[model samples]
Target: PLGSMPYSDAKAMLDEVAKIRELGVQRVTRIENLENAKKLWDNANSMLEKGNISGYLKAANELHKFMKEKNLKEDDLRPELSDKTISPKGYAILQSLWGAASDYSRAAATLTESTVEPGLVSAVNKMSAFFMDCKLSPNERATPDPDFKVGKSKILVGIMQFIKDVADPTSKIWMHNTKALMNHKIAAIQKLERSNNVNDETLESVLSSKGENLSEYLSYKYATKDEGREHRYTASTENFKNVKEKYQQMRGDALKTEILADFKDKLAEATDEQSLKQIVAELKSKDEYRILAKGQGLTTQLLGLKTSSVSSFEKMVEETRESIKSQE
Candidate 1:
């Protein structure tokens, strides 16, 4: 596989190319950018050589060391196809991978005929060490991939699809873990929105957007039958349903603790059912309980309880921490 495949990152980019070619684009513009991509690759190398940007070879070498630590090698992408070339892109779609593969250590202050591409719109509140290594001034900023767009981390998305398609026993290994990781990613994004202290309107904005690309893939892949003997392309729903549980489980957990904390005095002091009921009503009146109880999918068990004190409430509290804490 090592010889046959490109390094993981490169394989990912190549996979994007594979996806692009399959889109059935026309005989003209379809091929233009890809042709352009190879030329860009050539120019990229030329710049690398001409620059004494090899001066930054140390940067790449250290990067390679880390890549080696992680068991990756310099990717040889040729084997990903033969008697043919890969092919992800419109002219604009092409540059992202080209640039990332050999990012100029110098300023990208202007455009070039070679056209270095960057991933599309990123959503960020902060920077990571890796991106910072690009050494952009405070004025230079990182952006979100807005993966929904045709641009952005198409490579990573393609890699996810590629890994999802891995064959044999490893397919299950890859798919299940990928599913779990995606579940975590969905979970992580939700908490981030909440952290920013969005009110009812914007939070709804977070919950609502859905896409059709996975129109089929998102609709079926891991889908299972419903209780009513219904079946069709409901992959989108299934994907959300799967992660909905992960997100809710985390919410239930944190809320359970939060609920417990709020009720500490009342729960400890209540000798009779009446006092406990008051505290329960009082708790439900607060925004936290209302959220866990009636808000969207936030509640599973706590919503319709008739009793003031649910006996297993403590168990719920025991299961999770902050949703953010549970991401990994």
Candidate 2:
């Protein structure tokens, strides 16, 4: 019992595991492409299995690299921070800009002020430094007993603190970085969703996160927009207009007549416009509507089929309104 792991040690590992997992949630929240990060995930997981704490940390690290060009594996040649050097998370200082929007030129007014750029870059290299330290510490890779297990807990505890200093709301890193991170991610999600690379759930995740501070997430048909603070907006407006015109051409009388034949009794019920509108509205929403609408493509199949332009179809609807007035 004297040689065994302290209960505190096991608890420390799990607490760190939980924190590491939270960082993973934040990363997926930020990364643009899951597939792009897939290979980086495999690189770490090849040595680290999914069920373990170390594997999860490496996975989160891969996502942190997702936004960086070419997945930064450059040798971190910077001087290592001494523990006496104000290392807040077993690492060195985490800095902040005045805020996410305090532009670059503004920070130039005082050399003492930074835009969170150089500091974050320093942290990135420092994070890589942490990997090196843990690996070179011979006890960390120990195969047996208190040595291996204790070493594992210490490694994880340090990692958990490092992640916390970024993710924790009270931390300066969180204050400076959350808005920028959220902004970049919302942009990425919108870009991907426009291209159909992101799905419904992923789209919703990007749309908002309670306090993520997104002004808009590429609002169009998908989002409940409040862009009072936004200027530009994205929409498939012209594309959708073109599509509407095309579908209108498909809705020409050639297709309408074919549809009516299937409900000939209803169509012949001395139909006024509203009565005909109701009859067609109900049928238009049915699965059979598509099947019947397929007839709209019969330019070659039906020799007598009328191929009306969208404007021509508009004229037909216009003429029908005048005919209804005569009936009135």
Candidate 3:
């Protein structure tokens, strides 16, 4: 419909008309593509509501292909993506389920590292159902069963039960259980104590044995079982012998005090050499006094004998006479 006009103006008008026709065609094509995508989405959403996950996913995959082919945006099918049709809340729930699945995967890996054998496959299957069964009641969907849940130890709760025998201290599976970890040390001490009727010998063996570190301190406690002493020494194997020496030395000092008091009383009453000779002979014959004098060198102090002297009982008798005269 060209009225006679300048050639340039007519060419411009024709170009404008071509542009409008192309735009009109594009608009119609876009509307058709949107309608197709909308119906596909609507079908998928309906299947999802009925808990038909496979059916929904199948239709959704088709919608995905169509949208990509037509260069359509999700915004183009506004009512299709709307919450009333396919909820954002449903997407959140699916996200949570996926997160739970991965958490279970990490947990299974740790249980494996710890060499704990468990029914992880059964737990995995149960978790699969929990995730894929879209028709589960709201509560069931929201709160998965123990089989699907990962515990603090990074194993599924269901798998934890399967590994309980090993985790337990008294279970039949002691070979891999907690009790077996230190069984060698514990059993070693048990046998040492049970058989040794004398606690000192038991303690001595504990101090002497190799790879019996715990037993050393344990034996020290048992050896020094008397209630009154409050020495807070370090309970190392090296210190055990020293502690034994200190305990015996203190005991000997106490005995020496008692012996000294008795002897002084006997010497004070002695009237002559014969009686003093008898008292000195009595000190020489006593096993306790002999043992005490050997370590303590008490002959110098008690009998007034020189430290260098190898005192016969006659010399002890003469020293006792001198000690008696000094007391007077």
Candidate 4:
């Protein structure tokens, strides 16, 4: 009975004891201020967003330096420092918050960098159209319509062979999907070309104006037929091959002259690591294997000329051919 106390009083006493214990605990060593670290982290994030790689590197370096000076690890940062109500012991908490934030920021930055710009898309489309026409391995025996499933397999094999001839290894060639889609498309095109009911002008108009509807109709129609059941389009492979070759010649000429020449000029003028990095970034950004292969070819040739090594030039040719093969 003597020990019994009001609940409120007991709680208050416990709170006081807890406060006393907290007060008794020694403070850890305070090194750099939290605000400064936050600033650095923010700057780094900004640079990353802008695709300013050099600036981001500089800010990251500075943050690392600060961390080193304080003998602080990233884990030492506590979440409580970020709370507006609390005065952080040091910059450690902000640094920790920054580390987490940086991951997301960097991811966003990467996404921004990787986005396909309109100009590049246009270039790729043109290049794709061109490559669609080139002759692949002429040595491969052409299978008859019914046995090979016309549009899907035979045309796909031909397109793959052509791709193998011009693909670059260091780029995203979209090999399998591109081949499948292109073959299907070519089959459809060939069918349209042969149909007496649908002339070129009418087909072009339908394709331009009602493509979505036509695609759905074609899909449904193909579903009913035997070859269609196999997801093959009925069109002459030889005819498609002729058209494909025409486009390839056009694209190949562009690759040899325009794209390759410009890249060579850029590589030659690249003065520092930053400029070189920029060139690499631009090449990767193009995302088209043909463009990247051409760029690589030019770069290798330039390097070869500078170093007097024919090996670099040979390697470039080998890689360019390999890139084409990858498409196959």
Candidate 5:
């Protein structure tokens, strides 16, 4: 009988059988109308929450069928469903899993593509933050505000505009957000610059003065300590060498002048947070640029440094010592 069965007959029988089973195919089916579409979507969500991937898949399929029947698409499900807000609750869950998948994908991409830049990191971080923080309404409304109302922030807006040259990554809104972050950092840096009593010249002088003080103190301390024991100061020699190196590195007239000029230039040009961020990012990409960025960061910190008296400096020194000791 099997051999006798014609190919056409077998196919015809299979089609009939498939049609019968299709009637019970739970995943995808046309809904009655627009109202029923929403009800089905809600039901699908409930099933999804219950860890029913099959049910969710079915629902998605059914949604497609319903759309086809009504000449619709996912975008036309409902105003709320189509809106960013309405689907976020469900989307959030999907996205949580999606993130893990994305991480795996990124890792794979990194292996395949040797060069993963900070820009890529920034983009991914931004996307992750956007998905996690953005809210959607039932009518498909999305809260336009970023994690920190970045787009609305004046500083952020300014920064975005400043870094428009190299930092604009084909995304208008993202560029805006990046600019905002940069603006915030720049503001802090500016505030620090204002607070420091030392001018560019003064900063150089203070640094020089501190170097001299350190040199004299080290000579006296080492001589006294060495008198007690021959190798008592052996470990201290490395410590003194480090201090000497820091001074040497920081005290180059050309380098110090460059830093001063750069700081002033950065301050002068620092129109917004985003621009500052872009500058930092650009600098970070190159070895020489990174050193410049570090100097900028340090300058910001030094300019902001607040010490009212010896006690304040002493407290700071103690904190610094403790921090260094902790690393050991």
Candidate 6:
């Protein structure tokens, strides 16, 4: 049948399929025909929203054919999604709450599905204000953690991953939509080739000469039962990684703050050398104290707690009283 048709048209069909497969590497897809393709995409989207898988498949097939005719890339027509500014400290604080990170991870997974109402909608809504407030102002510090530089916002890094993975050509909060569409299109083209008795060897050889390989595209079609199954993208993983690190930092800050404050209170309440010795020993027993010992943790309050000359809390109290009396 392919031999009966004009060799050029038959061969061009295979090449077009190859081109779509090529675009698949970047998870991008084009419409078959511009006007009809847009309608198909819209229809497919509506079907997806309606949970009509059969309808989506049929519309995607129609869209693929139009895309094949002209190689109209979807990203070429859509405007790039805008970036959302976020605060590194605000993000860390939000994630530091117990079980909040787990909920965040769950929400991310659900959002990848492009569902109108994700399972964690309540959680997402609750944290929406905090996320919105993460935006930095002029001269605003990004984070107080000395490990990070001033104004070096981890939120920017995290949000970049969000934009790249969760929303790229559109802010639909879905991932790999174009790539999934392409997989189906290429598969449909191959189905046509099979039915038409097209020779695979000729198409493969031609694509090879054009420096194109369909191995990934071919294999990707069968990677999952549904080619459109959404999973974590590289950017998604990166966003989670950044968020987790900030969570750890926030936890560390909490512990350090609590331990240091208690130590100061104990020092103030100690009555004698015996009490002072126990308080000082408790301070050394804390792992946080060791970390603080090397940094700004060893403040005047800590250093003035003890000395070789006085060394006793009672003597320090007497010295304080004498100084106060003299000042009067």
Predicted model with the maximum lDDT: 3
| lDDT of the structure predicted as candidate 1 | 0.30
The lDDT for every candidate, in the order shown, is 0.30, 0.35, 0.40, 0.33, 0.35, 0.34
Worst 10 residues of 4 by lDDT: 225-234
lDDT of 6: 0.34
**Residue range 1-328, candidate 5, lDDT tens digits:** 5678988999999899998787766325443355576666666566545544324434544544565677654444545354323344455444433343344234323222323322433343343233223223335443321322211122221222233222433322221223222332333333334576434343222212212221122222222211232221112212222232332333222332233223323322333355545554543353322232232234444574431222222332332233223212
- On TM-score, the leading prediction is 3
By TM-score, the better pick of 1 and 4 is: 4
lDDT of candidate 4 over 75-110, digit per residue (tens):
443232333221121122222223323332232222
Give residue 222's error in model 1 in angstroms: 28
lDDT of 5 at 196: 64
> What are the TM-scores, per candidate, against the unseen true structure?
0.19, 0.20, 0.30, 0.19, 0.22, 0.16
- Candidate 1, residues 1-328: lDDT per residue as tens digits? 5466547877798889888777756444435533433343333333233322212222333433343344432232122212332222212223343332223112211232112111111110011122222222345444534352242222322222222222222212122333222222233334444577544354332222221122121222221222221223111212223232322333333333334333432333222355545655665555444333332222323465422123333322222222213212
Order by TM-score, highest first = 3, 5, 2, 4, 1, 6
lDDT of 1 at 131: 21
How many Å off is the CA of 188 in candidate 3? 46
lDDT of 2 by residue, 28-82 (tens): 6434343444445344434233223334344546645652544433222112212
Candidate 3 residues lying further than 4 Å off, grouped into runs, are 79-84, 87-328
Give candidate 3's error at residue 184 in angstroms: 45
Which portions of model 5 miss their true places by more than 4 Å? 1-32, 80-91, 104-328
How badly does each model clash, as a count of residue pairs? 14, 0, 0, 10, 13, 5
TM-score of candidate 1 versus the correct structure, residues matched by position:
0.19
Candidate 2 regions off by >4 Å? 1-114, 136-165, 170-180, 183-328
Residue pairs with clashing backbones, model 6: 31-67, 32-66, 32-67, 33-66, 87-134
